[PDB]
Design a protein around this ligand. Structure first.
Ligand SMILES: Cc1ccc(C(=O)Nc2ccc(CN3CCN(C)CC3)c(C(F)(F)F)c2)cc1C#Cc1cnc2[nH]ncc2c1
Ligand SMILES: Nc1nc2c(ncn2[C@@H]2O[C@H](COP(=O)(O)OP(=O)(O)O)[C@@H](O)[C@H]2O)c(=O)[nH]1
Lengths: 1589, 84
């Protein structure tokens, strides 16, 4: 410390400083003196060697860096021994990543180029405000910014730097940032859309258009440490209030003559500059909409060539008269949608002639139409206008119109339609009758006349057209469907819509339209009769059946459209009326149900010993119809009261049986049973039956048992009771006979919805199946009365039944509804393949544990082959804990919070508790919580701030039963309350529809009151004011609820969070002031293709808002909201806001639209480096979805949104699934099984198939049923291996084989996948030594021929001629002297031929050696001796590669020279030498390939070529390298298994390999970039996918 | 190991010293008879064309060594390989 103290106390002494530095090497503040000494004499004297040695001798480095030694090092860097010492010191100091990052930060602020580049080469990543913002705020040199951009940095950081630099006045840095952000040289486009650039000037756009010491220092440090003009310009989302800065004569106005596409949409322009339009003489795709225009320029058409003009949201004035002096014929499309026009353009006929599409939808053109003398017009649009009458000559001069459309117009007639007419869109008009002109059309295919009022719809006779493709006639008033005249004339119709029509019956000629693929007859409310001729229409795949109470026994899943056509066809074959009804008897214990049935049975062969289960048995009726009905002697004891609601059907007739031995009180015991009958079967009738007269006097019968029945039991909450009796159910009597007669009469006259359900007609196949089933009921073993599926198929095949596997689901469902057998179609049980015949045994053995008998009561464990399935049914019929016998007495419970200020309480008052309500509930509500259950409550809790107590609590002087839900007021409590509320409401709606049934007759009691409690005085108020839920929901306009006095108020969210959107993990509400939204046709996205999704502005940005209807359900919105709170991913659309006043849903807006519209409209924008990005993002989204167990339904090119058309963006595609075909997996469409992620993988493979094709198999628009064709074979797509292979792996018929979505993304993530054009396989046992190119392009392989575009199989060199030399010599040329040795080398230069013994031939016979050409002058070598040459034919150099024997072994060093590559430093390869030798061009003086392979396998180089150096090893691996630090980029493990020759070609790289089999691979030259460009593209996404967490 | 480098260099004294202190492919590639005697290899010898080394080794994808003899063009080595 003495030396340090002396040095510190004596400064400004170089001589003393030298001695101090010398003695330093032979301490937090100790480094301060050294830093001060270095800074003082940084360049005064060259005495830094001692300091460097001391630093090398010396946690010290971190303190030195903190001691600002970086400034001294930079000053020194800004003498071979000193340079080497400095490099070693820098390498030693920068070993730690933190020190390197600190040095980079401390060097970026100052303006330098060498130190920053050296540190970047050494590492020092620029993602640690971030770096670029700092370097852009200080106004640094352009070199620094460019160097930082070339390195790895975040896109959002560059965007922030763009905003910062735009804030300042600069051009170089701004242009560099724009080029990094928006420049697609491969596609010849500039994607400047999404950025909010204030303005555009030629200074920025100039450099955008097309027109070493640091590396050496970095290499030394590393060594020391180891020891076509552009076209498209998109300027859309920038708030370009004015663009006149580009109308000058700057350096780009000459370059602005090759645009062909200018995009200025979603801007605020006013008028296109005339100078810009006249200097833009090669622009044919200009669009400009969503701008604040006020009049058509009238000079925009004066350019040389223009097409696809688009001004579709501007506010153009009433007059748009085009200038007559302009005669532009180049215009094709002229969009003027959604403007403020009122007359059509007045010079459309003269200014433009070859106009194709004229769209004017949404305008306000009021006046009558002009003659419209356009000769080439193809498509005309006039929808959403205000038009009164068409001039008679409106379409008298347009003989090519195809799709004239006029929707939502006040038209009355149609003028002369040109004969070439093909499509009409006249919906939403006011047409009394179909005009004569429309009927006289000869080529009509798509006429839509919906929303009109047409009384008369003519039949096929009065339609001159024969090619009717589509017909839309929904929402009309049509009563007749005349078809009997000529049913075969409309045989070509596919779509025929007749919804919302006053139709009575479908005539018996609808079966002659065999091509009809969609017939819609819905909401007619009067059909009730589908004719049996609808069986020859097997081409119908959809058929809406709503508000049609058809007699067909509908099924939940066993009812598809094609299934309905099959059933109708079977009925057409042979129809028989059906006579079967269910007579299920209900009652209480001791009421005599069984004895009454037995006396009704007329059976004397039989103490009933109570009744377990349901005890089904059949009964035939001998009126002279058969009328076989099955009775279900329901149990009475109050333990089998949870299985009963499952066996209660609407299509049945009940009973209700008294016990008059008591009288006046048992009549009061049917309120449970009768209310349950009303709840489950609203429309069914009930027949009350007294059952004790022989032991009951006339008093009790004359008691209110006969009067209260007519006073209180008849109405007020009970079903339509038809008749009641007082039979004595012990012997046959007059009362019993009358009961039998009235039972029969009620059965004959059920009339469900006025349909007479007791005698409906069905195909004979169902009756035959029923007969077979009861025939087989006997021969089954008694222990298991059940037959399996295989036995059923054997029985169905054995007999004459003509039902295939498609009929069996519907047939077995109908036979189930009939009651002979029970079949469970739910594909979640382990019972779906087992068909339950003999339901009586099933019920009896099911109810076995209820009548049989440390822990609380009701909790049991597994105790006494089929048993593993036997429990599965028990938990499905609410038998298993056992909810029966579950401690009806409520256990003692202390609520953690009872302060009347933090508990949300909900009441659910109902007249009674429907059977098995609690059993279905506590089996549905279920960090594992702690909970204890009882008969009518659960109280499941996790924490003192997270609990839920739902139970039954009664009130004094209140006969009803009340359901109480208590939760804490916290967010977790709110979520718990919400979840319980949806569970209870869904159970009530699904299982007991009679509860939620607002009866029209009487009053709107709704039979179900859901009270919500609230207390004004927080704590000790002891009086919560009741409030009905619907009344509060009517108060949806405000958030606060307050009494008649406005002094006090309380938020709704605190008392009813299930109503206001506050029962979700995230607070999702929008301040209506920020939102700027209004419903309009203009703001509809994609013209209603997405449904009810409009365009709006939120928080200043643009968003897409989904608008719900006014159904006030608030159940689908919350269901859609709960899922969107758990999905955070860059490739998944993200939730922004969710309101309640309009009940909307705010989502991000993808500016480029959906994928389907893109590939159907912009086919030139789907470059090969964009389809891979789209597929990668979609695969990422599917992987994330399936990771969290969520399963997507179906992926289509419509369900994928594109956010930007820039290949190097962070996000390019996202998924979407809005609410409210051919892309179907062959696992569910053909058969029935639960949807799995394998179907999603199949749909994704379909999407890949459509993406790979330019337009896909969707342009055709026809029927689309592993039979898919080879895309390259007919779709014209370029080949793409490992993508076609991926499709074929994604389209296999076995779902278990198909890769998981987790692995499909991995397969889609490969730099080889993008950059690999063709992989040609040669004929077997063909060996090729040398190959040459010819450029269509072709390959000459040693002289076999190969075609690049045909794969036409049929030393070497390449003046359309070839030269080859045999192994024995004899040089030959095909459009010479035979040398003494074989010609080993050949090259085309102005030709050189090698020799085996050593000799060169120039076409000179000079011999050098005792054979491998190159270029860049020239180079090459013979044997082990490399040389160099030029046109002088002299050896300008001669270097012996054998001299490098000190490093490599003699095996590799002493071999010959196989090849050499020279750009600035020669690289020479030797035979079986895994270490390519690098030789300089001046100093005449190790790339160990085997080391690189070990880092990733012969490893012996066989051929190599430069552009990134590609080294082809003998093991079949292409090592990729770069000309900086010799760092390994990739080890391409091609399937060649070896490499013979690799070479560049026209930019691609051909590779020949031996696998015998010869493989010719064609890599892309861009491959070395795509190894890195993609690798940093995933991480910038991965971090994002982690930022959302 | 210095033995591999000594065998590659063909130094008889160095190889003997290393062996006595307490690589066949390298010796075959160098084609030194003394190194081979002191110390696959057959394929390497056939490719290089050292008849003595191949004979000594015979006395003492990776296909058979005779396969490369035809490609290398060594007629004598090919005949020797075919004989055995
Ligand atoms: C507006 C509202 C909602 C949505 C939406 O999809 N939400 C949504 C819902 C559910 C799911 C996942 N469930 C889970 C399981 N289910 C069984 C299946 C799927 C997903 C997901 F799958 F994402 F996770 C997204 C999209 C838009 C939009 C838009 C838009 C934006 N930009 C545009 N430009 N032109 C048009 C256009 C349109
Ligand atoms: N004496 C007499 N007994 C009756 C009459 N009706 C029913 N019972 C008795 O009711 C019992 C049958 O009850 P049951 O209907 O099987 O009970 P459930 O199956 O649970 O509904 C028998 O033991 C009969 O003795 C009647 O009219 N007279």
């Amino acid at each position: 410390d003495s030396v340090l103290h002396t040095l510190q106390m004596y400064p400004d002494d170089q001589e003393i400083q030298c001695l101090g530095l010398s003695l330093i090497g032979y301490g937090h503040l100790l480094a301060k003196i050294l830093v001060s000494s270095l800074y003082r004499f940084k360049d005064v004297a060259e005495i830094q060697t001692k300091g460097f040695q001391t630093i090398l001798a010396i946690s010290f480095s971190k303190l030195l860096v903190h001691h600002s030694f970086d400034l001294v090092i930079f000053h020194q860097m800004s003498d071979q021994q000193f340079l080497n010492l400095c490099c070693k010191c820098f390498a030693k100091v920068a070993m730690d990543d933190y020190l390197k990052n600190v040095m980079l930060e401390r060097a970026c602020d100052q303006n330098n180029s060498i130190m920053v580049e050296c540190l970047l080469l050494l590492g020092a990543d620029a993602n640690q405000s971030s770096l670029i913002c700092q370097v852009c705020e200080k106004e640094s040199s352009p070199k620094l910014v460019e160097l930082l951009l070339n390195s790895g940095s975040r896109e959002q950081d560059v965007r922030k730097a763009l905003t910062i630099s735009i804030g300042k006045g600069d051009s170089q840095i701004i242009s560099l940032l724009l080029r990094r952000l928006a420049l697609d040289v491969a596609n010849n486009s500039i994607c400047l859309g999404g950025f909010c650039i204030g303005k555009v000037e030629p200074s920025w756009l100039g450099p955008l258009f097309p027109d070493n010491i640091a590396s050496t220092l970095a290499r030394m440090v590393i060594r020391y440490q180891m020891k076509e003009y552009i076209t498209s310009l998109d300027l859309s989302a920038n708030e370009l209030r004015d663009i006149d800065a580009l109308s000058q004569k700057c350096c780009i106005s000459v370059h602005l003559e090759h645009l062909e596409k200018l995009e200025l949409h979603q801007n605020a322009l006013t008028s296109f500059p005339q100078q810009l339009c006249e200097t833009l003489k090669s622009l044919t795709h200009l669009d400009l909409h969503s701008n604040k225009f006020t009049s058509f320029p009238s000079y925009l058409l004066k350019m040389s060539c223009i097409a696809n003009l688009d001004v579709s949201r501007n506010d153009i004035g009433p007059s748009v008269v085009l200038d007559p002096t302009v005669k532009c014929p180049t215009l094709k499309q002229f969009n003027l949608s959604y403007n403020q026009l009122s007359f059509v353009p007045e010079n459309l006929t003269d200014v433009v002639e070859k106009l194709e599409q004229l769209i004017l939808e949404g305008n306000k053109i009021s006046g009558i139409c002009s003659p419209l003398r356009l000769k080439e017009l193809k498509i005309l649009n006039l929808s959403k206008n205000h038009i009164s009458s068409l001039s008679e000559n409106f379409l008298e001069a347009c003989p090519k119109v195809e799709s004239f459309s006029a929707r939502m117009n006040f038209l009355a007639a149609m003028p002369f339609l040109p004969p070439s007419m093909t499509i009409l869109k006249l919906s939403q008009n006011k047409f009394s009758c179909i005009p004569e002109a429309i009927l006289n059309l000869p080529h009509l295919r798509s006429l839509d006349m919906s929303s009109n009022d047409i009384q008369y719809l003519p039949g096929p006779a009065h339609w001159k057209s024969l090619n009717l493709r589509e017909l839309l006639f929904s929402h009309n008033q049509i009563s007749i469907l005349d078809l009997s005249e000529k049913a075969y004339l409309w045989s070509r119709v596919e779509k025929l819509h007749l919804s919302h029509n006053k139709l009575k019956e479908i005539p018996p000629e609808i079966g002659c339209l065999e091509n009809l693929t969609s017939l819609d007859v819905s909401y007619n409310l009067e059909l009730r009769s589908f004719p049996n001729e609808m069986g020859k229409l097997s081409k119908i795949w959809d058929l809406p059946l709503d508000e049609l109470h058809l007699n067909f026994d509908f099924k939940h899943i066993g009812c598809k459209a094609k299934d309905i056509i099959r059933f109708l066809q079977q009925r057409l074959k042979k129809a028989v009326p059906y006579n079967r009804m269910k007579l299920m008897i209900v009652g209480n214990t001791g009421s005599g149900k069984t004895t009454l049935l037995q006396q009704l049975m007329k059976t004397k062969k039989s103490m009933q010993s109570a009744t377990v289960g349901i005890d089904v048995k059949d009964w035939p009726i001998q009126i002279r119809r058969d009328l076989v009905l099955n009775v279900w002697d329901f149990a009475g004891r109050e333990e089998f009261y949870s299985t009963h609601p499952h066996f209660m059907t609407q299509r049945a007739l009940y009973l209700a049986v008294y016990d008059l031995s008591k009288g006046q009180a048992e009549v009061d015991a049917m309120k449970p049973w009768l209310f349950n009958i009303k709840a489950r079967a609203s429309s069914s009738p009930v027949i009350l039956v007294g059952t004790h007269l022989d032991v009951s006097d006339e008093k009790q019968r004359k008691a209110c048992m006969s009067k209260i029945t007519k006073e209180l039991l008849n109405k007020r909450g009970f079903p339509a009771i038809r008749d009641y009796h007082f039979v004595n159910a012990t012997e046959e009597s007059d009362a019993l006979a009358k009961l039998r007669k009235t039972i029969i009469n009620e059965s004959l006259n059920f009339k469900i919805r006025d349909q007479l359900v007791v005698g409906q007609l069905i195909p004979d196949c169902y009756v035959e199946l029923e007969k077979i089933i009861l025939s087989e009921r006997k021969n089954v073993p008694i222990e298991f009365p059940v037959i399996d599926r295989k036995r059923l198929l054997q029985l169905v095949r054995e007999n004459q039944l003509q039902l295939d596997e498609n009929e069996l689901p519907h047939a077995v469902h109908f036979l189930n509804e009939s009651g002979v057998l029970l079949h469970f179609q739910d594909p979640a049980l382990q019972l779906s393949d087992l068909y339950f015949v003999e339901p009586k045994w099933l019920c009896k053995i099911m109810a076995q544990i209820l009548t049989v008998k440390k822990h609380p009561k009701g909790i049991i464990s597994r105790r006494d082959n089929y048993m593993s399935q036997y429990f599965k049914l028990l938990e499905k019929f609410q038998i298993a804990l056992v909810p029966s016998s579950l401690s009806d007495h409520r256990p003692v419970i202390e609520l953690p919070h009872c302060e009347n200020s933090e508990i949300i309480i909900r009441l659910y008052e109902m007249p009674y508790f429907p059977m098995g309500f609690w059993s279905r509930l506590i089996n549905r509500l279920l960090l594992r919580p702690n909970r204890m259950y009882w008969r009518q409550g659960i109280y499941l809790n996790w924490s003192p701030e997270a609990y839920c107590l739902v139970g039954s609590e009664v009130l004094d002087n209140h006969p009803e039963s009340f359901l109480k839900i208590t939760v804490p007021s916290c967010r977790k409590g709110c979520i718990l309350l919400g979840q319980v509320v949806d569970h209870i409401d869904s159970l009530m709606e699904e299982w007991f529809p009679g509860l939620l049934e607002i009866d029209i007759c009487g009053e709107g009691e709704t039979l179900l009151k859901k009270w919500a409690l609230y207390s004004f005085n927080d704590g000790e108020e002891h009086q919560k004011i009741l409030l009905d839920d619907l009344m509060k929901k009517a108060e949806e306009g405000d958030l606060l609820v307050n009494p008649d006095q406005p002094r006090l108020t309380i938020p709704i969210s605190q008392i009813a969070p299930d109503l206001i959107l506050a029962d979700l993990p995230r607070n999702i509400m929008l301040n209506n002031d920020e939102l700027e939204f209004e419903q309009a046709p203009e703001f509809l996205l994609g013209d209603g293709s997405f449904g009810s999704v409009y365009r709006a502005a939120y928080e200043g940005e643009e968003v897409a808002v989904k608008i719900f209807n006014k159904h006030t359900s608030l159940r689908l919105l919350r269901q859609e909201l709960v899922v969107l709170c758990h999905l955070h991913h860059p490739s998944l659309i993200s939730l922004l806001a969710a309101g309640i006043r309009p009940r909307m849903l705010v989502m991000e807006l993808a500016s480029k639209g959906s994928l389907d519209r893109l590939l159907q409209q912009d086919k030139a924008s789907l470059t090969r480096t964009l389809q891979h990005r789209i597929a990668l993002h979609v695969a990422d989204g599917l992987r994330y979805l399936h990771s969290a167990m969520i399963i997507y339904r179906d992926l289509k090119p419509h369900n994928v949104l594109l956010f930007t058309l820039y290949p190097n963006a962070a996000i390019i595609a996202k998924i979407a699934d809005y609410g409210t075909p051919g892309f179907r997996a062959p696992e569910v469409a053909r058969g029935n099984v639960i949807y799995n992620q394998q179907a999603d993988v199949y749909s994704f493979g379909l999407l890949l198939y459509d993406i790979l094709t330019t337009g896909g198999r969707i342009v055709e628009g026809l029927k689309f049923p592993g039979k898919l064709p080879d895309p390259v074979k007919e779709y014209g797509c370029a080949p793409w291996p490992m993508v076609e292979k991926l499709i074929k792996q994604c389209l296999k018929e076995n779902p278990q084989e198909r890769p998981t979505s987790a692995q499909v993304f991995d397969i889609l993530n490969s730099a080889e996948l993008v950059c690999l054009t063709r992989r040609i396989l040669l004929p077997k046992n063909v060996i090729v030594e040398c190959m040459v190119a010819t450029h269509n392009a072709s390959i000459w392989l040693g002289l076999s021929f190969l075609d690049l575009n045909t794969e036409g199989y049929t030393c070497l060199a390449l003046e359309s001629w070839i030269v080859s030399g045999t192994q024995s010599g004899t040089l030959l040329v095909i459009n010479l002297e035979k040398m003494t040795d074989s010609v080993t080398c050949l090259y085309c230069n102005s030709l050189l031929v090698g020799t085996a013994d050593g000799k060169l031939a120039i076409f000179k016979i000079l011999n050098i050696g005792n054979m491998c050409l190159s270029e860049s002058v020239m180079w090459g070598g013979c044997g082990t001796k490399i040389f160099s040459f030029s046109n002088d034919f002299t050896i300008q150099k001669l270097i012996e590669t054998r001299t490098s024997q000190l490093f490599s072994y003699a095996a590799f060093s002493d071999s010959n020279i196989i090849t050499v590559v020279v750009d600035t430093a020669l690289y020479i390869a030797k035979q079986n030498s895994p270490v390519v030798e690098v030789w300089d061009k001046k100093t005449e003086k190790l790339i160990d390939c085997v080391h690189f392979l070990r880092e990733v396998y012969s490893g012996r180089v066989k051929t190599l070529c430069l552009q990134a150096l590609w080294i082809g090893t003998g093991g079949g691996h292409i090592l990729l390298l770069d000309l900086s630090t010799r760092r390994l980029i990739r080890v391409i493990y091609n399937f060649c298994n070896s490499v013979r020759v690799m070479m560049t070609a026209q930019n691609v790289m051909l590779v020949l390999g031996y696998n015998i089999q010869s493989c010719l691979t064609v890599w892309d030259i861009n491959l070395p970039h795509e190894v890195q460009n993609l690798e940093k593209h995933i991480e910038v996404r991965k971090e994002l996918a982690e930022k959302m967490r | 190991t210095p033995l591999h480098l000594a065998a590659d260099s063909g130094h008889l004294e160095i190889v003997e010293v290393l062996l006595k202190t307490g690589p066949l492919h390298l010796a075959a590639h160098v084609g030194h008879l003394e190194i081979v005697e002191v110390l696959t290899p057959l394929h390497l010898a056939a490719l290089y064309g050292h008849l003595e080394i191949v004979e000594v080794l015979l006395k003492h994808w990776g296909e058979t060594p005779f396969d490369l003899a035809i490609d290398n063009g060594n007629e004598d080595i090919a005949e020797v390989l075919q004989k055995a």
